Design a protein around this ligand. Structure first.
Ligand SMILES: CC(=O)N[C@H]1CN[C@H](CO)[C@H](O)[C@@H]1O
Ligand SMILES: [Ca+2]
Ligand SMILES: [Zn+2]
Length: 630
């Protein structure tokens, strides 16, 4: 056994078990008993202690003190690596480094790495909770009724996706003593969660996958232990962390570059489409109903629709237009041109835009630069992703049918080409929507002509956005995975997980806005307005989160993109929008300082902002209150 103390914190680490535990402000935490850190190969799991040779080195640096462990020989295969577990002098934080060394013609490839092993947290106490970044956020009591497994989180608990908006998780006791684990190297990483139904425990661990088939580079987790800590405070920890590395890009900062940003406050959302053209090979094809597959609303009709919506006194509107190009929604991409002839052509579309501006309303196209359809006019496999095994992925899920994925290295080329074309026919977009980018994982590509790491992928996607900000077109994408913050103005939404499920489907936990706690002054988000019959009004959640409202939110596919059943429930729309929007017109660019569960009652909550303005929402009474005091 090796023990360390420094700057308020103590790390102990057992040379034989490898289990570690660390302590600060007198609370302790330890690795779970009997769960060990593991490699995983195509052909079996190893513990790290399974190593043929293991050494340990006690180490003191100018920066900190801890231990460095080499691990060599496995099964019989060669293969080695290190770990380094240590206390930063400056801060009283603990840092965990998994470090590749030798990999060889491995055989098989190391498929995953579960380390550091999850911290013991097995109480049951209902005020003993776990926080996770699955979409807008989830608080998970060690009691909580329902099962929560990794396999029930989107994208398998992958960071930089809807599955984990931000690269961290945290576990908090009723004490007020908590820990936050931040993934400093997320691009090939995610979390794992095991909460059996009814608890008593909740285990959470970081996993790491290879980068183009090799672990390649150091992976690093940073733990900060807290005292007198609520879920709001925990969020701030990470906030600070990000700003301390200069990726807390505020709306303000963004405004100073493109001032139209401000124009987005108060506005109301209108998501609706032109052409629909589901293909025979599409997983959505209905070989009966040819009308369901194939439908068209002209630019003209959308023009009328928008006038009408002004006259009725809707107010300030952003229009997002799906399906505006010749191929039809989710057809032809990236060759999504020209604007649909049978809908009006460039003229009908230009005419419609002009008209939105003319009543002080804004407008974005719905566009796509990852999905790459075989049908596209200039389809060519040499532009497509190859996976680390050299294979080219395929599917035919969406409208346009058979597709692969465009290597992002080349996306910016195609953004530049398309949008330049759009703007030569007198179209002047206020915004644009680059689909998928911020929802899905970043691809990796082994094609030698455009080799690209997941890390690199997010950088290209961000380059796509930046072309738009540079031509005064604001940027939107599907959701809000935190990589995109520096370049992302607003989204299609930042929902909680339970909004993307049937209301009948049990929830995984209390809906707390972890993302907006961190980023509400950096990204504008519209919100669902649907009322659940026998349940919640989703407007209520809009308020807590200080967002703008969906007025009209047409699905593109029945069932998809949080399209609620019909076990639904609402008249009085514009009114409802106007209420939430005027809140948005106020505090839309401010921090969100606090969120609190009133009296520790889950179904009553308050969100306090920078200007003092508080939002109390009661989910028994289905009632809501917007003050000014705080
Ligand atoms: C909300 C939204 O635009 N979701 C889209 C997300 N992307 C898929 C295709 O990748 C579909 O177009 C889907 O409708
Ligand atoms: Ca859309
Ligand atoms: Zn490539």
């Amino acid at each position: 056994m090796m023990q360390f103390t420094m700057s308020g914190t103590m790390l102990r680490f057992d040379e034989t078990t490898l289990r570690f535990s660390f302590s600060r402000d007198g609370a302790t935490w330890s690795g779970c008993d009997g769960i060990e850190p593991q490699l995983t190969r195509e052909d079996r799991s190893f513990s790290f202690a399974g190593a043929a040779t293991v050494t340990h080195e006690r180490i003191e640096t100018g920066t900190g003190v801890g231990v460095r462990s080499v691990f060599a020989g496995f099964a019989g295969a060669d293969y080695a690596f290190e770990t380094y577990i240590w206390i930063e002098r400056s801060s009283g934080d603990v840092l965990c480094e998994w470090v590749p060394l030798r990999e060889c013609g491995a055989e098989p490839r190391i498929d995953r790495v579960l380390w550091p092993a999850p911290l013991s947290f097995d109480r049951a106490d209902a005020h003993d909770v776990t926080l996770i970044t699955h979409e807008q956020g989830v608080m998970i009591p060690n009691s909580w009724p329902t099962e929560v497994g990794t396999d029930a989180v989107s994208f398998g608990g992958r960071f930089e996706t809807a599955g984990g908006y931000m690269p961290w998780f945290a576990q908090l006791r009723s004490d007020g003593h908590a820990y936050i684990a931040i993934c400093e190297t997320p691009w090939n990483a995610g979390y794992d969660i095991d909460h059996p139904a009814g608890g008593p425990y909740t285990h959470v661990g970081m996993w790491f996958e290879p980068s183009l088939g090799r672990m390649d580079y150091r992976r690093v987790v940073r733990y900060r232990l807290l005292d007198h800590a609520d879920h709001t405070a925990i969020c701030k920890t990470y906030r600070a962390y990000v700003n301390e590395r200069g990726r807390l890009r505020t709306l303000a900062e963004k405004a100073a570059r493109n001032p139209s940003v401000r124009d987005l406050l108060g506005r109301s959302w209108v998501h609706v489409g032109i052409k629909t053209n589901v293909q025979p090979d599409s997983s959505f094809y209905d070989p009966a109903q040819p009308g369901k597959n194939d439908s068209l609303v002209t630019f003209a009709q959308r023009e009328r629709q928008m006038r009408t919506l002004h006259e009725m006194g809707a107010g300030r509107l952003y229009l997002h237009l799906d399906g505006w190009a010749q191929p039809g929604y989710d057809n032809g991409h990236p060759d999504y041109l020209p604007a649909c002839r049978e809908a009006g052509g460039w003229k009908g579309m230009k005419s419609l835009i002009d008209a939105c501006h003319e009543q002080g309303d804004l407008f974005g196209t719905h566009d796509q630069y990852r999905d790459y359809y075989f049908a596209a006019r200039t389809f060519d496999p040499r532009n497509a992703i190859r996976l680390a095994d050299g294979t080219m992925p395929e599917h035919a899920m969406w409208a346009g049918g058979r597709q692969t994925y465009l290597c992002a290295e080349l996306a910016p080329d195609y953004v530049r080409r398309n949008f330049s074309e759009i703007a030569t026919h007198g179209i002047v977009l206020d915004c644009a929507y680059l689909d998928v980018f911020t929802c899905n994982e970043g691809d990796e590509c082994s094609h030698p002509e455009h080799r690209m790491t997941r890390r690199e992928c997010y950088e290209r996607r961000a380059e796509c956005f930046e072309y738009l900000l540079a031509h005064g077109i604001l940027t939107s994408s599907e959701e809000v995975s935190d990589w995109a913050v520096p370049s992302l103005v607003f989204c299609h939404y930042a929902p909680y997980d339970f909004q993307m499920r049937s209301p009948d489907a049990p929830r995984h936990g209390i809906p707390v806005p972890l993302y907006n706690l961190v980023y509400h002054d950096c990204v504008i988000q519209p919100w669902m307005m649907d009322r659940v019959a026998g349940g919640d009004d989703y407007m209520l959640y809009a308020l807590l989160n200080g967002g703008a409202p969906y007025l009209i939110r047409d699905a593109a596919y029945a069932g998809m993109d949080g399209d609620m059943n019909a076990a639904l429930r609402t008249e009085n729309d514009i009114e409802r929008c106007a209420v939430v929007a005027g809140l948005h017109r106020r505090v839309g660019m401010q921090e969100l300082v606090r969120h609190d569960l009133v009296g520790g009652d889950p179904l009553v909550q308050r969100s306090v902002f920078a200007d003092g303005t508080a939002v109390t929402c009661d989910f028994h009474a289905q009632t809501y209150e917007v003050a000014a005091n705080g």
